[PDB]
Amino acid sequence: TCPFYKKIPGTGFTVDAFQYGVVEGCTAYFLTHFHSDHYAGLSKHFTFPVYCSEITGNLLKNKLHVQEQYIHPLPLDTECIVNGVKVVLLDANHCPGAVMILFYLPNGTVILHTGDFRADPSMERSLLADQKVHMLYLDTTYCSPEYTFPSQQEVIRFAINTAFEAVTLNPHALVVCGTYSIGKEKVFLAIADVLGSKVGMSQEKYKTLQCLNIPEINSLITTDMCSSLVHLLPMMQINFKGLQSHLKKCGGKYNQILAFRPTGWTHSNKFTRIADVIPQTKGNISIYGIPYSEHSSYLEMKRFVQWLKPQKIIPTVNVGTWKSRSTMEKYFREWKLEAGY
Ligand code: NI
């Protein structure tokens, strides 16, 4: 049965709640982004209205075959009316097509559901600045002070410089990047751009990427692996066995692999600067785990919430254990006392 933290009070609405069957009293289903923990349950047989971004709606139609008549895409940064309630979709700084949802309840309560997000000061100048928010349904993935990670810009600088150095030293090296969902496209796109190559991938992944409105994408990606020196592979194949096997397939075109696994956080973060990251190496194969996050660090999360000053916070992540829940509630109280709201 649907958990309370997926239900919007005073409306007929749910958020990311497609795996519970027909939810009692739900007249419209919102989907914040196309990640499987969130869309789980959607298919061509769904016949309720789904509200989402344009990009999410392209993925619903093309990848899951949801029928067009039930997809209701909304423009960003635009007041819209849904079953008599005003809503606004905002950029969540997560994967492509990911949104936060502002609901303006008929009784005057204003609710922000962040979906999955990476808080940024740029959000302090969206339509959020213009009214008070009473309740915040918060992506608390990394709600603990041990979770520090560098900016996305620093991580991409490291990756570009590392790849460009390796291939310049050895023109016969192949670069491989791991993927298992949408998100983190900058990793593989930036490396292909510095090397003057397209990124080669499976037809299924190319299809996925063509749904994302990324400008000049026909310019950066391809299904012709033979013409490409940056390859995308399933995240599960980014290990020494899976990579030795791939190198065999390239028919002696290459004699070395440099591979990247964009992880979220890994405890090498608490001790080591991005400058200082080193690969695991075996033979002619090296693997770098790089901390490219699409969720808030602790400090980014803290700043957003202390700026927004909500009256009540509802966590959406790490809610299944009493120790997690207790930890998060103690941080929310600190933040409120330190800021004075
Ligand atoms: Ni997500």
From Swiss-Prot:
It is found in: Nucleus. Disulfide bonds: none annotated. Changing D139N: Impaired nuclear focus formation, reduced interaction with PIAS and increased sensitivity to cisplatin. Changing H295A: Impaired nuclear focus formation, reduced interaction with PIAS and increased sensitivity to cisplatin. Induction: During mitosis. The mRNA encoding this protein contains an internal ribosome entry site (IRES) in its 5'-UTR. This 5'-UTR generally suppresses translation while specifically promoting expression during mitosis, when cap-dependent translation may be impaired. It comes from the Eukaryota. Expressed in brain, heart, kidney, liver, pancreas, placenta and skeletal muscle. Belongs to the DNA repair metallo-beta-lactamase (DRMBL) family. Binds constitutively to TP53BP1. Binds CDC27, which is itself a component of the anaphase promoting complex (APC). Binds PIAS1. May be required for DNA interstrand cross-link repair. Also required for checkpoint mediated cell cycle arrest in early prophase in response to mitotic spindle poisons. Possesses beta-lactamase activity, catalyzing the hydrolysis of penicillin G and nitrocefin. Exhibits no activity towards other beta-lactam antibiotic classes including cephalosporins (cefotaxime) and carbapenems (imipenem). This is DNA cross-link repair 1A protein.
